[PDB]
C-alpha cells in the first residue's frame, strides 16, 4: 500500500 | 563466515546440498556471488535461478524443483532472511570503549561494556545500562536513563529526565525530549508553558533519523515496546503509542494523540490530536486523520496525481462541488 | 524552587483561600498531583472529582471555589495562571552552565556577562553573545553571528554565519538557522549554484522547535518577527518574512519569498507556496495547501479527510472522473430545459 | 574579494559599457545595491527605475542598454551571469580551515592535500578525504566512507559507514547520509530488525540541503546521480535511485526502491510511493500525491487547494459523499430517459 512497507 | 550446515541449523532450515559451503555474507539475487547467501519470496524469480550466482538460496518447498544451487527450505523466506542477516551482520558499532574526548559528568552511572564515542556529552545524573553504546557527538541530558543494550548513533540528542528501555536503536539527528509546543496567550502574546513531563520509551524501540519526540507538558509522552518510527517524524507532547505500532517516514502527530497496538501509519500522514486510534489500524500514505478511529482496518485519504491539464479541471470542479450539488438538487426538483 | 503558597498567590495575583504557609514544590497534573504540588482546574466538570486530587493547592475560578477540597487560588484565568506558575516552578535545567573547557571559541568572539557555553560547542570568529546567553553542548555558531541577551540554544543547534538573533529567544536541538536557500540558475540542464549571501534576522522572544530549518536569503534577508513561535520539523525557505506573534505548528513547509503577516496561526503540516502574501490574522488549518495569496483575515482550510479504504477508493475514482460527471450534469440540464 | 569592473566583465564574457576601472566589492539586489556593488536586471519593467539604483554597475541585455544609468555589463543571460558573478564575489565562508586540534581523526584515515576539518569533527577508521575536502565542525564521518575532492560538509553533518560521495558536493547542516531504513520481518506481530548492509553512492556536484535524510540500501545501494540538487528535510528511503540533474524541493518524502529518472523536477512536500519508476523529464508540482508509476515525461499535479473554512466544510462533505451524488445523477438520467 501507499507509503507502507 | 560460517559453514552452510551450521547456518541452516541456526535458521531451522532444511538444507539441500553441500553443507561444507562457507557463507560470508548476504546479497540480493541479482548481486550474489560465490560466498553469499540470498533469498527469494516472489515466484517470478524461479525461471532465472540459474543466472543467480549465490552459493545458497533461501526458498520455500514449492521453489525447490527450480533450484539451481544449494537451497535452504523454510516456511518464511523473508523472516529467515532477517535472521541470517543478523548472523552475518557487518554493521559497525556507533562507538567502542570510552573516547578520551567524550565529556562525561562525574555523577553519571555506567554499566559493564558501555561505549561512548568521540565528543559525546553525558550530563549529570545520567544512567547508562550494560552494553549501551553512545555514538560520537551525542548529547544525553540530565538524569536521563538508557537501558541495557540500547544504542544511539552519532549526533543524537536526548534531553533531560528521559527514560529509554533495553535494546533500543536511535539513528542520527533525532531529538528525544524537546519542549512540547505549549503556550498560553495573553492578549495575542504567546506565554511559554514549561514542559516538565518526560518521554518514556519502552524496550526494543527503533527510531529513525531527524525524528523529534517532544516531552509531555506535565505527564509523559509514551512510546510502547517494540514500536518502530522512521525518519522525519514529529511526535508531539503527551502522545501515547501502543506496543508494536510502526510509524513510517515524515508522519506528523499532534498533541495528546493516542495510537493503539499493532497499527501501521503510512508515510507523510497527518494525525490530529486529542483523539484515539484503536488497535490494528492501518493508515495509508498522506492520510489526513481528522477524527478518532474506533474500528480496526485500512483507512485512506487523498485525491491522487493526474496529468496537470486534467488536474486543473478536477480541482476547479471539486472546489465548485457545492454549486454542482445545488444544480443536481434543482434538477431533481424540476424532474 | 520551593515557595510558600501565600508568596505564590501574590506573584500570580491570585486570591488565596487556605493556609498560605503550605510549601509548594512543583506543578503537577490533577491526576498525578501529590502533597507539595499545585495543580489547576480548567474544566468545571472536575468539580465533583476534586476530592480525588491530592494536590496541596488548586488554581480555579470563583465559581469553582465552593467545590474545592484543598487550599484554592482563585483567578480569572486558570490556564494563564498555570503557565505563569509553571514558569515560577520550572524544573527545566539550563542547556549549559559556565564555559566548558572542551568548547572551542574563537579568540575574536565577544561574550557578555553570565554567558554559558556547553561542552564541545564551537563558536566562530566575530561572534557576539549578549548577557545571559546560553549555548548548549555541541552547538555551532558561525562567523559574525549575533545572539541577543537572554537567548538560549539547546544542544546540537546549528547557526550559520551573519545570522542575527534577538533577545530571549529559545531554540530547540537539531535545528539549523541560516543554511543556503535552494537557489540555482540553470545552464543547459546543469544547475549553477547561486551563492546565498543574504542572512536570517530573528526578532525577540522567538521560540523555535527541534529539527526546524530556516534558510538564509539569497541577497536580502529571511526575517522572523518578534514573539513568533515555530514548532518542530518546520521549513522556512530563503526570503520568507513572518510577522510578529505568528504561530507555526509542526511540520509546516514555507516556500521562498512567502510573506506571512502578524497574528497568523498556521496549522500543522500545512504547505505554503511562495512569492505571495498572507495578511494579518489568518488561520490556516492543519495540512492546508496554500496556493494563492490570502488578502482577508479569517479561517481557511483544505483537504479531503480519511475514509475506510474501500470507501476511499470509490471517492477517489469518482473525484478523478468528476469532469465526466460535470458533462453529464450539463447534458441533463439541457434536456430538462427542452434544448 | 574586490575586482575591477573590466576584469569582472572579462571573467563573465560580458560587454563592458562604462569605466573598466570601477572597483566592484560585492553583489547586491537592485534595491539594496550601494556604491561598489554590482547588481543585475532581469525584468525590463525596471528600465525606468534604473536611475533609482545606487549600484556601481548593472548586468543587463543589449535591449536594456539605452536605459542604463550606470556602467552596464551586456550579456545574453543576466540571470546566469548573476549566478556566475555571485560565485566570483561570494562572501560565504568555508566550513573550516586547516585541521582543528579538537578534531578526532582515526590514524587510518587517509587525507588528501589541503583538507580542512573543523573543531570537534570526528573521522572514523578507513575514511578517505580527497584533495581540498572541507569538513565542518561537529561532523561525523563513519568507517570506510569516501568523500571526493572539493566536496564540503557544513557543520553537524552525519555520514555513516561505507558511504561514497563524489567531487564538488555540498551538504548543509543536520543532514544524515546512510542511516538504517525500515527493514523488518514481522514475527507474530513482533518486529525483527534486518541489518541494512547496502550503501549510499552520491555522485559529483550534488547539493543536499539541511536536515535531509538519505538511508542506505538494504543489500544493494541507494544512488544519487551527478548534478542532483536536493532541498531541506527530504526523506530518501533505502534503495531509492535519483537520476542525474534531477531537482528535489523541500520536504519531499520518497518510499523505498523508488527510481527517479534524469532531469526530473519534484515539487516541495510531494509524497512518492516506492517500488516503482518515474521516467526522465517529469515534473511533479508541489504536494503531489504520487501513488503510481509515471511513464511519460510531462507535468503532473494533485491536491484540492485552500478555501474559506465555511466553504471547505461543504466541499469536503460533498466529496466524501460523492458516491451518493453519482448515484443520484445516474437515477435522474434514467428517470429523464
Ligand atoms: C500555538 C498553539 C499554542 C495554539 C495553536 O494554534 C496550535 C498549536 N498546536 C498545534 N498543533 N497542530 C498540529 C500539529 C501537528 C499535526 C496537526 C496539527 C496545530 O495545527 C496547532 C495549532 C494550530 C491549529 C490551527 C492553526 S495553528 C499550539
Ligand atoms: C530548483 C529550483 C532552482 C527551480 C525549481 O524547480 C524549484 C525550486 N524551488 C522550489 N521550491 N519549491 C517548494 C518548496 C517548498 C514548498 C513548496 C514548493 C518547489 O516546488 C520548487 C521548485 C520546483 C517546482 C516544481 C517542481 S521543483 C528551485
Ligand atoms: Mg511533511
Ligand atoms: Mg572536544
C269-298 residues labelled b (16+ CB within 10 A) or e (exposed): bbbbbbebebbebbbbbbbbbbbeebeeee
State this model's resolution in angstroms. Answer: 2.0
Q: How far is the CA of C113 from the centre of ligand 2 (A)?
A: 44
Using the beta-carbon criterion (under 8 Å), do A3 and D182 form an inter-chain contact? Answer: no
Integer angstrom CA distances of residue C158 from B141, C4, C163, C172, C231? 18, 41, 11, 10, 16
Residue closest by Cα to atom 12 of ligand 2? D268
Instruction: Kindly report the backbone phi and psi dihedral angles of residue B239, in degrees, each rounded to the nearest multiple of 5, phi listed first.
Output: -70, 150
Ligand 1 and B282: CB distance under 6 A: no
| Cell reading at B28 | 540480493
Integer angstrom CA distances of residue D61 from D21, D24, D34, D67, D79? 21, 19, 21, 10, 10
Which residues of chain A lie closer than 8 angstroms to B245, CB-CB?
Answer: none
B254-267 residues labelled b (16+ CB within 10 A) or e (exposed): bbbbbbbbbbbbbb
Domain(s) of CATH 2.160.10.10: residues in chain B: 98-335
Atom of ligand 2 minimally distant from the CA of D286? 20
By the 8 A CB rule, do B93 and B116 touch? no
Domain(s) of CATH 3.40.1390.10: residues in chain D: 1-98
Q: Provide the CATH topology of domain B98-335.
A: UDP N-Acetylglucosamine Acyltransferase; domain 1 (2.160.10)
Q: How far is the CA of C77 from the centre of ligand 1 (A)?
A: 21
A-chain residue closest to B251, CA distance:
A3
Strand partners for C60: C74
Domain B1-97 maps to which CATH number in 1.10.150.20, 3.40.1390.10, 3.30.565.10, 3.30.300.90?
Answer: 3.40.1390.10
Report which bound ligand comes closest to the CA of D286. Answer: 2
Q: Please give the Cα distance from B193 to B175 (Å, whole number).
A: 20
Render B199-258 in DSSP notation, one character per residue. EEE-SS-EE-SS-EEEPPSSS-EEE-TT-EE-SS-EE-TT-EE-TT-EE-TT-EE-TTEE
By the 8 A CB rule, do C302 and D304 touch? yes
Helices (H), ranges, C182-321 = 309-320
Would you please indicate which residues of B are annotated as catalytic (active-site) residues?
237
CA distance B259 to chain D (A): 16
Ligand 1 and C54: CB distance under 6 A: no
Number of H helices, E strands in chain D: 4, 39
Atom of ligand 2 minimally distant from the CA of C186? 3
Technique behind this structure? X-ray
CATH of domain C1-98: 3.40.1390.10
Ligand 1 and B254: CB distance under 6 A: yes
The Cα diameter of chain D in Å comes to: 87
Q: Which of D17, D37, D238, D275 is catalytic?
A: D238
Q: Please give the Cα distance from D137 to C120 (Å, whole number).
A: 10
Residue recorded with cell 574579494: D1
Closest in D27, D82, D323 to C315, CB measured: D323
C-chain residue closest to D104, CA distance:
C120
C99-339 belongs to which homologous superfamily?
Answer: Hexapeptide repeat proteins (2.160.10.10)
Using the beta-carbon criterion (under 8 Å), do A2 and D291 form an inter-chain contact? Answer: yes
Q: Which of C251, C268, C270, C305 to mutate to test the pocket of ligand 1 (most atoms within 8 A of CB)?
A: C268
Ligand 1 and C274: CB distance under 6 A: no
Domain(s) of CATH 2.160.10.10: residues in chain C: 99-339
Q: Please give the Cα distance from D219 to D238 (Å, whole number).
A: 9
Q: Is domain D99-337 classified as CATH 2.160.10.10? A: yes
Beta-carbon-side half-sphere exposure of residue B195 (alpha carbons within 13 Å): 25
Q: Look at strands D128-129 and D110-111 and give their pairing.
A: parallel
Ligand 1 and C287: CB distance under 6 A: no
Q: Please give the Cα distance from B254 to B243 (Å, whole number).
A: 19
Closest in C154, C250, C305 to B234, CB measured: C250
Q: How far is the CA of C275 from the centre of ligand 2 (A)?
A: 12
By the 8 A CB rule, do C141 and C147 touch? yes
Report which bound ligand comes closest to the CA of C251. Answer: 3
CB atoms within 10 A of CB C21: 9
Ligand 2 and C276: CB distance under 6 A: no
Ligand 2 and C132: CB distance under 6 A: no
CB-based contacts of D19, cutoff 8 Å, min separation 6: D5, D71
Using the beta-carbon criterion (under 8 Å), do D197 and B25 form an inter-chain contact? Answer: yes
Number of Cβ pairs < 8 A linking chain A and chain D: 10
CB-based contacts of D330, cutoff 8 Å, min separation 6: none
CA angle B182, B183, B187 (to 5 degrees): 165
Ligand 1 and C267: CB distance under 6 A: yes
Mark residue C77 as left, alpha or beta (left: phi above 0; alpha: psi -120 to 50; beta: remaining): beta
| Cell reading at D98 | 586547516
By the 8 A CB rule, do C190 and C184 touch? no
Q: Could you tell me which chains touch chain D, where touching means 3 or more CB pairs under 8 A?
A: A, B, C
Using the Cα atoms of residue C313, residue C315, residue C316 and residue C321 in order, give the sign of their dihedral: positive
Domain(s) of CATH 3.40.1390.10: residues in chain B: 1-97
Q: How far is the CA of C152 from the centre of ligand 2 (A)?
A: 33
Using the beta-carbon criterion (under 8 Å), do B27 and D193 form an inter-chain contact? Answer: no
CA angle C314, B267, C309 (to 5 degrees): 20
Strand partners for B228: B206, B246
Residue closest by Cα to atom 1 of ligand 1? C247
Radius of gyration of chain A, Cα coordinates, nearest whole angstrom: 4
Which residues of chain A lie closer than 8 angstroms to D269, CB-CB?
Answer: none
Report which bound ligand comes closest to the CA of D231. Answer: 2
Domain(s) of CATH 2.160.10.10: residues in chain D: 99-337
Q: Please give the Cα distance from D249 to C237 (Å, whole number).
A: 10
Strand, coil or helix: C198:
coil
Q: How far is the CA of A1 from the centre of ligand 1 (A)?
A: 29
Q: Please give the Cα distance from B110 to B129 (Å, whole number).
A: 6
Q: Which helix (H) or strand (E) holds C190?
A: strand C190-193
Atom of ligand 1 minimally distant from the CA of C287? 17
Which residues of chain C lie closer than 8 angstroms to B196, CB-CB?
Answer: 26-27, 86, 90-92
Q: Which of C233, C239, C274, C292 to mutate to test the pocket of ligand 2 (most atoms within 8 A of CB)?
A: C274
SS3 content of chain D, % helix, strand, coil (to 5): 15, 30, 55
Q: Look at strands B189-192 and B183-186 and give their pairing.
A: antiparallel
Strand, coil or helix: D158:
strand
Report which bound ligand comes closest to the CA of C194. Answer: 2
By the 8 A CB rule, do D224 and D203 touch? yes
CA distance A4 to chain D (A): 8
Integer angstrom CA distances of residue D266 from B138, C181, D249? 33, 17, 6
CB atoms within 10 A of CB D246: 24
Residue among B29, B154, B270 with most chain D CBs within 10 A, to mutate: B154
Render B263-274 in DSSP notation, one character per residue. -EE-TT-EE-SS
Which residues of chain B lie closer than 8 angstroms to A1, CB-CB?
Answer: 266, 282, 284-285, 298
Q: List strand residue ranges (DSSP E) for D134-221, in order.
A: 134-135, 140-141, 146-147, 152-153, 158-159, 164-165, 170-171, 176-179, 184-187, 190-193, 200-202, 207-208, 213-215
Which residues of chain C lie closer than 8 angstroms to B173, CB-CB?
Answer: 174, 211
| Cell reading at B272 | 490530529
Atom of ligand 1 minimally distant from the CA of B184? 3
Q: Please give the Cα distance from C140 to C103 (Å, whole number).
A: 10
Residues counted in chain A: 5
Q: Look at strands C253-254 and B103-104 and give their pairing.
A: unpaired
Amino acid at each position: 500500500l501507499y507509503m507502507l512497507p | 563466515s560460517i559453514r552452510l550446515a551450521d547456518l541452516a541449523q541456526q535458521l531451522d532450515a532444511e538444507l539441500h546440498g553441500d553443507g561444507d559451503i562457507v557463507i560470508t555474507g548476504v546479497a540480493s539475487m541479482q548481486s550474489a556471488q560465490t560466498g553469499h547467501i540470498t533469498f527469494m519470496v516472489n515466484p517470478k524469480y524461479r525461471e532465472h535461478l540459474g543466472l543467480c550466482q549465490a552459493s545458497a538460496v533461501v526458498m520455500t518447498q514449492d521453489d525447490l524443483p527450480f533450484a539451481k544451487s544449494a537451497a535452504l527450505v523454510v516456511k518464511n523466506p523473508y523472516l529467515t532472511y532477517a535472521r541470517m542477516a543478523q548472523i552475518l551482520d557487518t554493521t559497525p558499532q556507533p562507538a567502542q570503549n570510552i573516547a578520551p574526548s567524550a565529556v562525561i559528568d562525574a555523577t553519571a552511572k555506567l554499566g559493564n561494556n558501555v561505549s561512548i564515542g568521540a565528543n559525546a556529552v553525558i550530563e549529570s545524573g545520567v544512567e547508562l545500562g550494560d552494553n549501551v553504546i553512545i555514538g560520537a557527538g551525542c548529547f544525553v541530558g540530565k538524569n536521563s536513563k538508557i537501558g541495557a543494550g540500547s544504542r544511539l548513533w552519532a549526533n543524537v540528542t536526548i534531553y533531560h529526565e528521559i527514560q529509554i528501555g533495553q535494546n533500543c536503536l536511535i539513528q542520527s539527528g533525532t531529538v528525544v525530549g524537546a519542549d512540547g509546543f505549549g503556550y498560553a496567550n495573553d492578549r495575542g502574546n504567546w506565554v511559554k508553558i514549561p514542559q516538565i513531563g518526560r518521554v518514556i520509551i519502552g524496550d526494543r524501540v527503533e527510531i529513525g533519523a531527524c525524528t523529534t519526540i517532544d516531552r509531555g507538558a506535565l505527564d509523559d509522552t509514551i512510546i510502547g515496546n517494540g514500536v518502530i518510527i522512521d525518519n522525519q517524524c514529529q511526535i508531539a507532547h503527551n502522545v501515547v503509542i501502543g506496543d508494536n505500532t510502526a510509524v513510517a517516514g515524515g508522519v506528523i502527530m499532534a498533541g495528546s494523540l493516542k495510537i493503539g497496538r499493532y497499527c501501521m501509519i503510512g508515510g507523510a500522514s497527518v494525525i490530529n490530536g486529542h483523539m484515539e486510534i484503536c488497535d490494528k489500524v492501518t493508515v495509508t500514505g498522506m492520510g489526513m486523520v481528522m477524527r478518532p478511529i474506533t474500528e480496526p482496518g485500512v483507512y485512506s485519504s487523498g485525491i491522487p496525481l493526474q496529468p496537470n491539464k486534467v488536474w486543473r479541471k478536477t480541482a476547479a470542479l471539486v472546489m465548485n462541488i457545492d454549486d454542482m450539488s445545488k444544480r443536481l438538487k434543482s434538477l431533481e426538483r424540476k424532474v
